[PDB]
């Protein structure tokens, strides 16, 4: 896409890994609640980005 390009150009990639790990934990606490399995595609995409 464009996020990893703008970030790796402007430096500070940790500001992206930490933010995506937070968007993984939050989207996982919103998955254990109202219990479902088979993690959504957005979580898989963020895991690939990290």
């Amino acid at each position: 896409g464009d996020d990893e390009i703008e970030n790796f150009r402007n430096g500070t990639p940790d500001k992206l890994v930490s933010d995506s790990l937070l968007k993984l934990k939050r989207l996982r606490k919103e998955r254990i609640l109202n219990k479902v399995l088979k993690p959504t595609t957005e979580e898989r995409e963020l895991y690939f980005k990290v």
Binding site: I32, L33, K35, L37
Partner: protein, 46 residues
């Protein structure tokens, strides 16, 4: 005056430390009949 006392009893306790010690049982987070369902689902998944 850092402490204000009123005619009622709950606010009088709340001003002091004893506020939460007038209950017959301490509040709970695992007695909810929904939390136990989620925990049992996670255990069955594992």
């Amino acid at each position: 005056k850092p402490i204000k006392i009123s005619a009622d009893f709950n606010a009088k306790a709340k001003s002091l430390g004893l506020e939460s010690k007038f209950s017959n049982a301490t509040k709970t987070a695992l007695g909810d009949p929904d939390t136990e369902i989620r925990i049992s689902a996670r255990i069955s998944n594992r």
